[PDB]
Design a protein around this ligand. Structure first.
Ligand SMILES: [Mg+2]
Lengths: 252, 226, 414, 180, 168, 107, 40
RNA sequence: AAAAUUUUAGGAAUAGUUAAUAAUAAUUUAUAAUUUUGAUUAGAUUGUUUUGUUAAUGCUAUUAGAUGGGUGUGGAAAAAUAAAAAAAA
């Protein structure tokens, strides 16, 4: 019969797409929280390695029929803050959403503008991040970002990332660009094509020590009531990071 | 599982600790995750003596017959201000009185500094509800120099007991974005003169003489007499 | 409607020897007698009240038509919408009639057969063309249009009678498929598009070369009406999200691939001419080419998904606008803690029409044939990767005993 | 995990919990009381027809006189005897492989038997608990720190296989005759 | 867990056996030497069946590149400059492992990832999801760290004291 | 094709299927109808679903609603017992009146 | 059983328990000393 | 999940029914299933060497204390009397 074809273990479950709490809304700052680290990692990778199709001469041109099918997942950089047509523009002025770009602005490139483009059918969102100023990180001559005028060093370049409006965060997640390339800035001093080779001297032996380390200030036990033994409470050494077994820096 | 105490040691049930692993033991109760908590009962049981002896007016009632003398209203306002901070100031109460809403400033708990604990949160954004004393605060966490990469929510923000030391240089206008504080060992170079690590992962503070004496007297080693 | 939606859990209608000279047992009335009596009563009531529910129409001459219209306007007892709803429920009951006869059945054996509703279809078509606009671009009216076309095809009544006869005078004579492709509203869902395409295929029994053939022997677009009809059938709103076929099972996928193959075969010269990146200088033709390419690509992607990931959560279907009780239960509850979802175990697996889908035997054979047809005449089916994978899947399932081949599948594969 | 829990006998986790070795007692008068060292679940399986995972032994609380004094006399031969039985292979299997729990009375009994060190609760009032000082502990460790390789070999012999062949055993195992 | 195999068979059945050819496809890449960009050759190894067409070989290359630098853009396969017909098989062209197959790319056209067939797919249909290693690259009885060894806890017959018969 | 494979457990039908043989007794008209009407009913149902969307949608929604609201949706031991009236025959009469008999087959 | 010494933090609540699980810093230090002895 | 063992002085019909199924949530197909080799309903009774007795493979005992609407919680309902039990320093 039909009832005894298989047991009832592991039944078919509704996908996370239908569930509202699973998906992420673009209006909420969680969208920018999810997409900012990917943007900064992509910029770090492009500042040291040539990514083939991360920089284009003009916006990607596809027929309107295939636009909704092909655009999601696309990501590319251009010079200047020109925006694609058929896209209602919404600038992100919310500080709660903007705070997630703070590290990207401070350490990679000063972030100037954040915009969300909603299409006519509200089914293909675009995220445009316009950065002003040269790259803080050193840029290799072979790096992809060396091509951009406003990156290597007006002086503004935009990054466009196409996604779908209501999807789980895995759709936003970008992992193809998590390729680690070395930065040769600390090693450029000793390179043959650098005129600083005869300056540094190798310190091959540790200097003789006549004094020990300065003694730490006398330990003062805490005064306020503590919650208890964090090791027994399975709390990481400061509630932040580490291992519970290797307890350290918690009131003692 | 992920983080056992003393490895796998089942000599007694107490040797496993008050909790087996920091992550929630059941997938259906994420609120059971291990984290540092605060004495919410004491920090929310405010003193009613300040409220006593002063008349109060309910917000709903705006009828004329329920109105009070303006001097009584003023003393009611000051009494409510005292009552709301009797057990300590809130992080929102501190941020409401600072320029740029205290963005870029460091907030720390009373117990985050005493002992080997050295922890503070650098504010990045705050969203007040219609009740300004509550809301949601996002900031960067710095623990013994190491600083997180992204702003996270501040746990027990509404619970009072916070302290801030405002610095005009750290103030960030709303136009810009708060930069994450640099990592003392990673981002900026290590400098023993600027910052010195209070405790390293294998450091244990020496036993205080008062604690040792108390323990010996309780155990009966030292001759404690009335 | 009560008959159609009757709960048939414990019916168990099979021949019992002991009930030769009497009906079913007293305790078996609800099980093995109620549905048969209900449908016989439906048959009798329809035979009694058909001429009342759908009065006979008489066009006569032009003056006779004017008099008939005046009488209808004087006495519009039932409007076209409710008449159509009644006819649809009657057709559903007729299709789901009782078929098995018993020796105890004192009535005629021809009674347990589906009804003939040609006159009722004619009358409802007369009222539909009498009213100014029976069909609307809304999806509900798309469903009504699909139902009307289905009624016409089932009861061999020529279409376009729902529509004003001036178009028929212009086109001399229009077949059911031509009428469907000329008056079909642009769908909003892949399911609606599948229904429309199936109706298009079914309307022309053997004249498929006259209803979807818009090209000449050289590739020039001759009939632009068919081109526009196909263009609005394969709409972006229905095939745009790259997941348009996420709720399409094997039968619907077969329908889609058959429609694509038929279009390509009837317009082979046009496609093989304008697939070489040659501009047609016509926005309509470019849009049609793009829509066809998108439809073919998404259909092939869905077929590959079903073939390579059977029963997986990726290859799961669900009825359109399906009801998920978990969301409603969460919305209408105490949200004190948002991680405390109620009825989680039941609601995670509960959904309307959600079931795992994998390719069967007939489905796999027909899909292999259609994918072979979708390529060129000189294209190597041996080199075609998907066809070989489908054939090997059929062989593997037949050797593992998870399915069996019938003579239809043998004739499809040989 | 229940609406109205069993207040007179609660536990720490759900049923059936981890195996625990305990001395199950009978329901008789004290004069004829005896215990059974058995391993069972944390929650007693008195409902089902299988109650214990294994039966380790029986203990007699009441001491009996030495019935073997006329035999070869040794020191303290004529003191009262407390007879008890204990399975060794099963105990070691459950203790090491299955990693079952352990109560305090079985722990004390096995401490007498010599399988395990004296229990945590077998504490005298003669000396209080030790007081630990981090600096003194570190100084002692620095004074007596063992070699890395020596400690690795010690723990390998204690935990991994202790039947490690020597060069002589390997040479004897190696074929020397015409290899066929 | 329904893998269409409910018995034990150590031998390898004939249907699973496949005839393969170790082809190599070379791409013209550019590396940044101390002076500038210099031309180099990057070789990707594939196992293509003897009865495979040029289109099938191209699809295998796209699947098995496993690098966001070789098959990023559209390309076509040629031998000695002469383009290979994608509708022809390897037998007609006489291609062997010694044959040098070059790939010429078009920068303007970008190769969209339209591959949905898993790289581990075979006739047995026993595909391991979330596995990006090709079926040929890794082959070993690697130890498993996700699970844990399990010993028997419920005894059968004997529980303790005297064995007697054992109650088998 | 008359013998099963002891090594693999395959029955004689599986052995004949693998060998390409055919062991099918001459079927009567009722048996032929049983083997032939499955495709007819499937085609009828598919045609109805593709031809009457509103009726099929209403029927499917009602069926899903009753399935979801059923009291014994959970798949516990009692629901997983192949023969509920026979296995849990203590409940019949006093508590459950759905089945008037505790035995329906040769078990 | 978790010990609740009288000198723990008193919860001035009439709707729940009268004593809290928070402990004085000496109790934390003493508890660690007892933890070390059980670790042996 | 299976196989064997299964009570009554005055012995007969039983039924949300059997199998097949592209059918989870069966609008279909069948010459269906149970039973005089003792069924179903009704009565009695906690099923599988434990008691008593005898020369006895006889006769006579037995709380293995086991299950759909009360919360869909939980890994698992058994969850509102008890039943000698150590439950996170
Ligand atoms: Mg009987």
């Amino acid at each position: 019969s039909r009832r005894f074809r298989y047991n009832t273990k592991f039944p078919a479950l509704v996908s996370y797409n239908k569930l509202p709490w699973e998906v992420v809304n673009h209006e909420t700052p969680q969208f920018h929280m999810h997409v900012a680290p990917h943007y900064e990692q992509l910029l770090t990778l492009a500042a040291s390695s040539p990514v083939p199709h991360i920089i284009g001469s003009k916006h990607i041109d596809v027929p309107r029929e295939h636009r909704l099918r092909l655009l999601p997942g696309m990501l590319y950089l251009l010079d200047g803050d020109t925006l694609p047509g058929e896209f209602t523009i919404n600038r992100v002025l919310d500080p709660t959403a903007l705070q997630y770009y703070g590290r990207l602005s401070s350490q990679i490139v000063t972030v100037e503008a954040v915009r969300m483009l909603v299409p006519d059918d509200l089914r293909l969102l675009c995220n445009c991040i316009t950065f002003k100023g040269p790259l803080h990180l050193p840029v290799a001559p072979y790096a992809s970002l060396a091509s951009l005028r406003g990156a290597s060093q007006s002086n503004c370049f935009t990054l466009y990332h196409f996604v779908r409006p209501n999807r789980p965060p895995k759709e936003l997640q970008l992992e193809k660009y998590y390729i680690h390339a070395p930065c040769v800035a600390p090693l450029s001093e000793f390179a043959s094509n650098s005129d600083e080779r005869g300056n540094w001297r190798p310190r091959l032996q540790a200097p003789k020590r006549t004094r020990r380390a300065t003694p730490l200030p006398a330990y003062r036990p805490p005064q306020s009531y503590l919650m208890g033994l964090a090791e027994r409470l399975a709390v990481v050494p400061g509630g932040c990071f580490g291992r519970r077994s290797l307890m350290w820096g918690h009131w003692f | 599982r992920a983080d056992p105490l003393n490895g796998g040691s089942s000599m007694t049930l107490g040797s496993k600790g008050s909790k087996l692993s920091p992550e929630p033991h059941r997938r259906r109760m994420p609120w059971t995750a291990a984290k540092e908590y605060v004495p919410g009962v004491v920090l929310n049981a405010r003193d009613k003596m300040v409220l006593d002896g002063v008349q109060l007016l309910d917000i709903e009632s705006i009828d004329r017959a329920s109105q009070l003398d303006p001097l009584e209203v003023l003393r009611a306002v000051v009494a409510t201000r005292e009552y709301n901070i009797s057990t300590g100031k809130n992080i929102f109460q501190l941020a409401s009185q600072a320029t740029y809403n205290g963005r870029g400033q460091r907030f720390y708990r009373k117990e985050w500094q005493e002992g080997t604990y050295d922890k503070y949160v650098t504010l990045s954004a705050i969203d007040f509800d219609r009740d300004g004393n509550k809301g949601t605060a996002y900031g960067y966490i710095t623990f013994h120099g190491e600083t997180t990469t992204r702003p996270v929510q501040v746990d027990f923000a509404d619970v009072p007991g916070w302290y801030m030391d405002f610095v005009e240089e750290r103030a960030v206008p709303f136009t810009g974005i708060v930069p994450p504080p640099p990592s003392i060992g990673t981002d900026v170079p290590v400098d023993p003169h600027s910052y010195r690590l209070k405790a390293y992962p294998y450091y244990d503070a020496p036993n205080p003489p008062e604690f040792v004496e108390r323990l010996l007297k309780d155990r009966g080693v030292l001759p404690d007499t009335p | 409607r009560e008959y159609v939606l009757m709960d048939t859990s414990g019916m168990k209608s099979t021949i019992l020897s002991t009930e030769l000279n009497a009906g079913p047992d007293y305790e078996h009335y609800d099980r093995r007698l109620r549905r048969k009596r209900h449908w016989l009563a439906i048959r009798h009531r329809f035979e009694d009240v058909r001429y009342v529910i759908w009065p006979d129409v008489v066009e006569e001459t032009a003056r006779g038509d004017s008099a008939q219209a005046d009488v209808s306007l004087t006495n519009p007892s039932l409007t076209a919408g409710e008449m159509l709803e009644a006819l649809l429920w009657l057709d559903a009951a007729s299709t789901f009639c009782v078929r098995k006869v018993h020796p105890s059945d004192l009535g005629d054996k021809s009674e347990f057969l589906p009804l003939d509703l040609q006159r009722e279809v004619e009358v409802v078509a007369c009222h539909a063309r009498r009213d100014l606009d029976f069909f609307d671009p809304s999806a509900t009216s798309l469903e009504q249009f699909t139902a009307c076309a289905a009624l016409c095809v089932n009861h061999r009544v020529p279409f376009s009678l729902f529509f004003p006869a001036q178009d028929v005078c212009g086109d001399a004579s229009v077949s059911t498929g031509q009428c469907i492709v000329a008056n079909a509203p642009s769908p909003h869902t892949a399911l609606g598009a599948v229904r429309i395409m199936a109706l298009i295929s079914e309307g022309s029994g053997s004249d498929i070369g006259k209803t979807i053939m818009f090209s000449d022997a050289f590739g020039a677009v001759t009939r632009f009406g068919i081109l526009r009809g196909l263009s609005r059938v394969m709409s972006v709103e229905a095939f745009g999200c790259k997941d348009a076929l996420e709720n399409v099972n094997e039968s619907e996928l077969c329908i889609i691939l058959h429609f694509c193959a038929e279009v390509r075969e009837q317009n082979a010269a046009f496609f093989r001419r304008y697939e070489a990146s040659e501009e047609d200088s016509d926005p309509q033709q470019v849009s049609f080419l793009a829509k066809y390419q998108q439809l073919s690509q998404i259909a092939l992607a869905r077929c590959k998904r079903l073939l390579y990931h059977p029963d997986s959560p990726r290859a799961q279907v669900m009825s359109e606008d399906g009801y998920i009780p978990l969301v409603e239960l969460q919305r209408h509850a105490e949200g004190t803690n948002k991680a405390a979802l109620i009825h989680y175990n039941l609601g995670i697996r509960s959904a309307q029409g959600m079931r795992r889908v994998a390719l069967g035997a007939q489905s796999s054979a027909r899909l292999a044939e259609l994918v072979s047809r979708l390529e060129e005449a000189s294209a190597r089916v041996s080199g075609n990767t998907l066809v070989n994978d489908l054939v090997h899947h059929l062989s593997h399932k037949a050797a593992a005993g998870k399915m069996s081949l019938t003579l239809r599948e043998v004739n499809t594969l040989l | 995990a229940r609406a109205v829990i069993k207040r007179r006998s609660p536990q720490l986790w759900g049923a059936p919990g981890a195996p625990i070795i305990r001395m199950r007692g009978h329901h008789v008068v004290w004069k004829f009381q005896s215990y059974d060292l058995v391993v069972e679940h944390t929650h007693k399986r008195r409902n089902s027809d299988i109650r214990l995972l294994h039966y380790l032994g029986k203990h007699c609380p009441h001491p009996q006189k030495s019935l073997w004094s006329p035999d070869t006399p040794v020191a303290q031969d004529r003191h009262l005897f407390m007879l008890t039985t204990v399975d060794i292979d099963a105990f070691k299997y459950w203790f090491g492989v299955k990693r079952c729990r352990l109560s305090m009375k079985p722990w004390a009994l096995l401490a007498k038997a010599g399988l395990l060190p004296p229990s945590l609760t077998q504490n005298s009032k003669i000396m209080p608990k030790p007081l630990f000082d981090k600096e003194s502990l570190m100084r002692y460790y620095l004074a007596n720190r063992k070699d890395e390789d020596v400690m690795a070999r010690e723990k390998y012999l204690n935990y991994e296989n202790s039947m490690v062949k020597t060069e002589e055993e390997r040479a004897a195992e190696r074929p020397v005759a015409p290899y066929l | 867990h329904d893998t269409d195999r409910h018995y034990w068979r150590a031998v390898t059945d004939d249907p699973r056996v496949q005839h393969l050819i170790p082809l190599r496809i070379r791409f013209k890449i550019f590396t940044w030497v101390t002076s500038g960009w210099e031309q180099r050759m990057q070789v990707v190894q594939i196992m293509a069946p003897k009865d495979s067409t040029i289109a099938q070989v191209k699809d295998l290359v796209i699947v098995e590149n496993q690098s966001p630098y070789l098959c990023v853009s559209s390309f076509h396969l040629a031998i000695d400059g002469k383009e290979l017909d994608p509708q022809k098989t390897l037998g007609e062209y006489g291609i062997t492992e010694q044959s040098q197959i070059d790939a010429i790319e078009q920068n303007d056209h970008l190769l969209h990832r339209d591959d949905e067939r898993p790289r581990d797919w075979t006739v047995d249909e026993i595909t391991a999801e979330d596995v990006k290693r090709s079926p040929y690259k890794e082959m070993e009885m690697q130890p498993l760290q996700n699970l844990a060894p399990r010993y028997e806890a419920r005894p059968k017959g004997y529980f303790g004291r005297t064995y007697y018969s054992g109650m088998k | 094709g008359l013998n099963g494979c002891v090594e693999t457990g395959r029955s004689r039908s599986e052995v004949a299927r693998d060998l390409g043989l055919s062991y099918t007794r001459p079927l009567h008209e009722n048996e032929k109808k049983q083997l032939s009407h499955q495709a007819v009913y499937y085609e009828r149902l598919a045609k109805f679903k593709m031809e009457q969307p509103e009726a099929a949608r209403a029927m499917e929604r009602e069926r899903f609603v009753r399935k979801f609201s059923g009291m014994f949706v959970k798949m516990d031991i009692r629901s997983g017992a192949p023969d509920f009236p026979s296995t849990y025959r203590r409940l019949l009469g006093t508590k459950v009146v759905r089945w008037a008999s505790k035995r329906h087959g040769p078990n | 059983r978790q010990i609740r010494p009288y000198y723990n933090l008193p919860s001035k609540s009439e709707h729940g328990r009268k004593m809290t699980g928070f402990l004085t810093p000496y109790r934390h230090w003493m508890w660690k000393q007892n933890e070390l002895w059980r670790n042996v």
